[PDB]
Design a protein around this ligand. Structure first.
Ligand SMILES: O=C(NNS(=O)(=O)c1ccccc1F)c1cc(F)cc(-c2ccccn2)c1
Ligand SMILES: [Mg+2]
Ligand SMILES: [Zn+2]
Length: 274
């Protein structure tokens, strides 16, 4: 009843954070070996090395809905690529506590973030999304592989998820409960997006205005402004209350000085030209 506790994927060895229900015989091995392109999981270095020489995948399946320079996103329908998405969900569960869904991947669309070189498109992370979210969740689960965490890739995927919400003419919010790292990442993302808009629009924006500009829900906006102490309350209404000294002294922290990977909406292929 040994669990999977270590994986080898690409040129990375990664320790597990949580139990993932790989078949029992796969957990018995010291490490489990993942093809970084098709996400097939294997029990031995020799089966892994043989697969690397045979596997012709060099990128995620599905449609490449984003490509700028060597940063790429693939949209993968869980129904059209069931095995690939199950493998993805088992991999993700090694690093996600709350994720309970691994094999019934059909209700979901998966957005795979990759980093490309001459060899292929190397998986960095993903977020899943319900094709029909009754709550209004524009992200179900989001996971960045540990060697890529805290390096801007999670920020890119969060920004990407709100770009999709904009093109759908809707607001959206990540599904709860958030992971520990997702909660910090969303709070940091919401802060920068809201603080940048208030700096560049003179604050002449309501909470509803910000919600339409960013596809962030009014609730997530309000709780973020509350954390920034930038909202007044008047007769049941939340009112933005902000000055330049407030905006700048919150913006000029070290948090908002790493240059992001940036979602260039020009390179997002949402609708075909015909
Ligand atoms: O890698 C991430 N965060 N660091 S970040 O990209 O540089 C960044 C900077 C500023 C603002 C936001 C932001 F994401 C990241 C983001 C998430 F949503 C989830 C996970 C995650 C959680 C659980 C397991 C694996 N992965 C990791
Ligand atoms: Mg590790
Ligand atoms: Zn493969």
């Amino acid at each position: 009843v040994k669990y999977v506790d270590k994986i080898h994927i690409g040129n990375y060895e990664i320790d597990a954070w949580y139990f993932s229900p790989f078949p029992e015989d796969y957990g018995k091995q010291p490490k489990l070996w993942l093809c970084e392109y098709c996400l097939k999981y294997m029990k031995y270095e020799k089966s892994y090395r043989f697969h690397l020489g045979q596997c012709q995948w060099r990128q995620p399946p599905g449609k490449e809905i984003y490509r700028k320079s060597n940063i790429s996103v693939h949209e993968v329908d869980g129904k059209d690529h069931k095995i690939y998405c199950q493998n993805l969900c088992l991999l993700a569960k090694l690093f996600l506590d709350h994720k309970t869904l691994y094999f019934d991947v059909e209700p979901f669309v998966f957005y795979i973030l990759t980093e490309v070189d001459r060899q292929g498109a190397h998986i960095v992370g993903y977020f899943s999304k319900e094709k029909e979210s009754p709550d209004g969740n524009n992200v179900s689960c989001i996971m960045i592989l540990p060697p890529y965490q805290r390096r801007g890739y999670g920020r890119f995927l969060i920004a990407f998820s709100y770009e999709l919400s904009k093109l759908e003419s809707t607001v959206g919010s990540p599904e709860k409960p958030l992971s520990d790292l997702g909660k910090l990442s969303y709070r940091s993302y919401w802060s920068w997006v809201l603080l940048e808009n208030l700096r560049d629009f003179r604050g002449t924006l309501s909470i509803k205005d910000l919600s339409q500009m960013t596809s962030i829900t009014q609730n997530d906006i309000i709780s973020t402004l509350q954390s920034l102490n930038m909202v007044k309350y008047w007769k049941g209404q939340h009112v933005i209350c902000v000055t330049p000294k407030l905006v700048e002294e919150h913006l000029k922290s070290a948090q908002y000085k790493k240059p992001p990977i940036t979602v260039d909406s020009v390179c997002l292929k949402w609708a075909p030209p015909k």
